[PDB]
Scaffold this active site. Sequence first.
Site, short mmCIF file in Angstrom:
data_model
loop_
_atom_site.label_atom_id
_atom_site.label_comp_id
_atom_site.label_asym_id
_atom_site.label_seq_id
_atom_site.Cartn_x
_atom_site.Cartn_y
_atom_site.Cartn_z
N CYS A 1 52.69 -4.79 41.22
CA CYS A 1 53.97 -4.09 41.16
C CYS A 1 54.11 -3.23 39.92
CB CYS A 1 55.19 -5.06 41.23
SG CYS A 1 55.51 -5.76 42.86
N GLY B 1 73.27 -13.36 48.02
CA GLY B 1 71.98 -13.77 47.47
C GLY B 1 72.16 -14.18 46.04
#
Length: 281
Positions: free
Chosen positions: A258, A61
């Site tokens: 978040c 990634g």
Amino acid sequence: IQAHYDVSDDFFALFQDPTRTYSCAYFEPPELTLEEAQYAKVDLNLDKLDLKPGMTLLDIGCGWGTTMRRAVERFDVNVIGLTLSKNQHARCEQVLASIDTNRSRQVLLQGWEDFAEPVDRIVSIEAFEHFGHENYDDFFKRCFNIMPADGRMTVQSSVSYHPYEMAARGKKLSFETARFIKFIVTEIFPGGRLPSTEMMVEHGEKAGFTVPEPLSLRPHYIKTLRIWGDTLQSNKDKAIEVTSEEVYNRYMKYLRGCEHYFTDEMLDCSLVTYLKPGAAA
Ligand SMILES: Nc1ncnc2c1ncn2[C@@H]1O[C@H](C[C@@H](N)CC[C@H](N)C(=O)O)[C@@H](O)[C@H]1O
């Protein structure tokens, strides 16, 4: 439908630092700028990997290539990066080619699923949330198998807590958190799933890895999300122009939410180290 929640690189450029790092920074010492703290986070991961010159590091990634380049530069290693984005692929190529090194450098447009070449070490910084629980065994088995006897891997990932552990905080907040997590995993990381830290540790153990006590990055993610949010909000009209008020609102929801749930200790971010049996001391 999965393509609907895709957004252009120019939107993210409106809240991220110059490195384009899309993961928790590391404010050590606390006075580092976001950009500095992104590099400190890269180092924090790489320093745990026992990288020696001439090794091959795999970045699963690899985003825009900052981790790979920093590894070549600091550690004089070969690198290979895996990404699912063509744009990241093309940029990474440029970043890699421009490095003054004789070391090998390679970026591949593919998943870990289709990657099976020998590497010495693995870094994966917040790609794990995309994989889904059903793939964890295959992920760890692949990572164990491609590495030599002294191999090591770090995986950094946002994590949630089991419904049962969340219940201890009261039903209201617990159901509200689960809904927000569902939102993250529908509109921010489609098809995704947040592991708990326990799942990260236990699937690694099952594959054969030694797993020390994970590092919590919670207060660092708080700072990160605060700077990301304040920055997006300041670039609001530019954001809306390039996307929409919808997409702007979505990411503000994500970033504020978040931060809020991190501050409330209803979410965490774990940097977990995985040591093969023959890893150095
Ligand atoms: N199965 C997969 N294999 C390889 N990469 C993936 C997979 N799923 C998602 N990704 C990538 O994981 C990255 C997720 C980012 N959150 C992190 C990028 C980067 N390491 C950073 O810190 O900025 C993106 O590059 C995605 O393309």
